[PDB]
């Protein structure tokens, strides 16, 4: 979630993803830990049996065969981590991840209840106000001369400067509010 997807994937990335998915499905099939280890070791043996194949056409054919076999043998109901997409409690706490821009509308009497926190927040808003101009210029100057672009953003190069487009990355609500 913290890195933009590439334009494509190489054989390395595709095969690694297949390895992970097949291992997790093998675990979902083999409930017991010992059985899971027994079969996962065989799975690594199979995967490495063709580790060094320098005829990329045969490599891709092998990968296609592996993927079709995976789709044939995938567990109908796999194991999903509770917070993982498609798992119970995936978004269970998105109700309470209310954003920070709401505090701007608080009544002054409500702000009175929390004096210090809002002073610190005022400092933060001042910092963002200062840094916006420099960070926009930074992105404009770091734009690639060619017409080839990637989602990944630049770091702070100058000194005393916040990283470009940082307000939304920072300040995001806590996972369990």
């Amino acid at each position: 979630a913290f890195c933009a997807p590439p334009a494509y994937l190489t054989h390395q990335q595709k095969v690694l993803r297949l390895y992970k998915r097949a291992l997790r499905h093998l675990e979902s099939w083999c409930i017991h830990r010992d059985k899971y280890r027994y079969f996962a070791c065989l799975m690594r043996a199979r995967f490495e049996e063709h580790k060094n194949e320098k005829d990329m056409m045969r490599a891709t054919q092998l990968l296609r065969e592996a993927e079709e076999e995976f789709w044939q043998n995938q567990h109908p109901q796999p194991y999903i981590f509770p917070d993982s997409p498609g798992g119970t409690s995936f978004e269970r706490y998105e109700c309470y991840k209310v954003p920070e821009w709401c505090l701007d509308y608080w009544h002054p009497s409500e702000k009175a209840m929390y004096p210090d926190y809002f002073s610190k927040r005022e400092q933060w808003k001042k910092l963002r106000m200062e840094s916006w101009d420099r960070e926009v210029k930074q992105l404009q100057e770091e734009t690639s001369p060619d017409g080839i672009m990637t989602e990944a953003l630049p770091p702070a190069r100058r000194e005393g400067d916040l990283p470009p487009l940082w307000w939304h990355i920072v300040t995001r609500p806590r996972e369990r509010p």
């Binding site: 979630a1 933009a4 997807p5 109908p76 498609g86």
Partner: protein, 154 residues
Amino acid sequence: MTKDMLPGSYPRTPEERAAAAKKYNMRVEDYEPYPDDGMGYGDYPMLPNRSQHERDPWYQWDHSELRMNWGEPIHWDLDMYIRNRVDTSPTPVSWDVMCKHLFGFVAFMVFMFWVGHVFPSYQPVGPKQYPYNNLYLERGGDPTKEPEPVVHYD
């Protein structure tokens, strides 16, 4: 918004097609207009008919649960294809086999229910015998008329 930025009529020439693609933020080669059947689709791009369920779940989409980024061309059937409705996601079993299996199970169940109806299962006993003319009075019968004497024995 102005005319150039709002949709328009079926792209009738390749220069129109390129202008439309630039309007929709779509590639000149990916942009395909709906067939000119005269049903109002007009210029709108024909996007893949895959539900938002299929979109990458881990990505930080601009519009999150919609799972669409800002400026992305929007399918003509987005409301149907949102995560809360139709799901065109791949299935572990082929749709044809799933249909066969479900309908075959239903057929077997109903056929065997008919078999049971035709050939019921019962214990080896006679019908329950009730007294007083099969309770003529207290089973809803007129006092004046006399029911046929229904008798019981040992």
